[PDB]
Design a protein around this nucleic acid. Structure first.
Length: 427
DNA sequence: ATGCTCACACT
DNA sequence: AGTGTGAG
């Protein structure tokens, strides 16, 4: 049986990243209950990132700042830059590039979002096990590492539990066998400690990490001990870990498919999936999903860390909810020009930085009354980085959606505009 | 009326 | 090409 122990994979998550960026810039915010908001006028603004000191009062993402101030009256707020009437996340994108360039010195990186990256450590671990002669790994090389599932068997503070688990792990490690998956994970954790130290020294930013044998376990592991800590989930820890792990906590099972798994099979925890045959799971959820679930509930997953540090699309969108839905033609043309101008700015920077050009322009809208994220998607050729042509072209491909018989009223009103540049080629 | 993004699979 | 899903 192939046991899903072939790779060493990490997931790095910058703790409340947008908050850390504002705290670095403004020392008055450091070590305080702090949140980042956008659009201050409506209910004090929408919270998009929350410091751990503020989370202790119950402040969360997606809260209105006016409501968060009820939970935490001393909450400090930083607001996202606004440019051309919309939130502008350039500062956080630039900080993200800072961190990812440092991570890239250690191993192969897949950018997962602005604040998360997967790390393929398999080759870096091999090189390091050769430089290691055959010498023990000291607990001093793992000063922020938790071993999930330990300590076990025959201390009242969190740091003493951490070290007792690490001691039990290390005392048991079979360091003579350079083939042992547990040893390989441990060396991987040593490298992640070094990577996280380098990020903090060179940027000031802290992060948490998970180290395991695949992306799903690494991501799960990273959330186990936060903030500014890292967790190693071994193959052997999976049966106990999954025995009480709600299905919705595993990456890609937090939405409709995960709910169907729960409801069709009559189970609650990831480990309960082991009692079904692969054919049974495929019959309920399809060939691909069924095979994936059969392997995943045993801790096995093969999605590669893709060598990809740059986004594949560059996009710009704004929502127009409630009374603010766009209902005139010049209004729609105005906001398209606004999105096209920010898009041109970011595209030009991308071409200068990363030696590539986008070739397709995707336009998406949502109309008032519709229920889903996007009402309609249309595309055209992106031949020149010119905001006025891009906005003119985007209007052309959507102007037929105007049900209004009047030419300069727009009905139904538009609740969302979206411009995305894609289909990049080397330049 | 948190938002603004980004990747991938189905057809 | 256009849609639906899942995520930060």
């Amino acid at each position: 049986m192939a046991t899903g122990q072939d790779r060493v994979v990490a997931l790095v998550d910058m703790d409340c990243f947008f908050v850390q960026v504002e705290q670095r810039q403004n020392p008055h915010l450091r070590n305080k209950p702090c949140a980042v908001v956008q659009y201050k006028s409506w209910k004090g603004g929408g919270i998009i990132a929350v410091s751990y000191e503020a989370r202790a009062f119950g402040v969360t993402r997606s809260m209105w700042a006016d409501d968060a101030k009820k939970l935490c009256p001393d909450l400090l707020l930083a607001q996202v830059r606004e440019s051309r009437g919309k939130a502008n996340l350039t500062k956080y994108r630039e900080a993200s590039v800072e961190v990812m360039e440092i991570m890239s010195r250690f191993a192969v990186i897949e950018r997962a979002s602005i604040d998360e990256a997967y790390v393929d450590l398999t080759s870096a671990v091999q090189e390091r096990l050769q430089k290691l002669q055959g010498q023990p790994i000291s607990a001093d090389l793992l000063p922020s590492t938790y071993i999930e599932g330990l300590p076990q068997g025959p201390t009242v503070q969190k740091e003493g539990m951490r070290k007792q688990g690490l001691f039990q792990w290390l005392d048991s490690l079979q360091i003579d066998n350079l083939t042992s998956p547990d040893l390989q994970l441990t060396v991987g954790a040593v490298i992640v400690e070094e990577m996280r130290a380098a990020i903090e020294r060179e940027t000031g930013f802290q992060c948490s990490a998970g180290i395991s044998h695949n992306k799903v376990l690494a991501k799960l592991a990273c959330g186990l001990n936060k903030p500014n800590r890292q967790t190693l989930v071994s193959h052997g820890s999976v049966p106990q870990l999954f025995s009480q792990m709600p299905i919705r906590k595993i990456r890609s099972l937090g939405g409709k498919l995960g709910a169907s798994v729960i409801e069709i099979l009559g189970i609650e925890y990831m480990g309960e999936l082991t009692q079904f045959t692969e054919s049974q799971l495929q019959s309920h959820f399809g060939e691909k999903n069924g095979s994936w679930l059969y392997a995943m509930c045993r801790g096995i997953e093969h999605d590669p860390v893709k060598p990809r540090q740059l986004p594949k699309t560059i996009g710009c969108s704004k929502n127009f909810p409630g009374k603010t839905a766009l209902a005139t033609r010049e209004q729609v043309q105005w906001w398209l020009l606004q999105l096209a101008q920010e898009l041109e700015e970011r595209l030009t920077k991308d071409r200068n930085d990363n030696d590539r050009v986008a070739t397709q322009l995707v336009v998406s809208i949502r109309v008032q009354g519709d229920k889903r994220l996007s009402s309609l998607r249309r595309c055209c050729a992106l031949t020149r980085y010119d905001a006025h042509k891009m906005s003119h072209d985007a209007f052309t491909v959507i102007k037929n959606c105007n049900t209004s018989g009047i030419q300069t009223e727009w009905s139904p009103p538009l609740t969302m505009l979206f411009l995305c540049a894609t289909k990049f080629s080397a330049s």
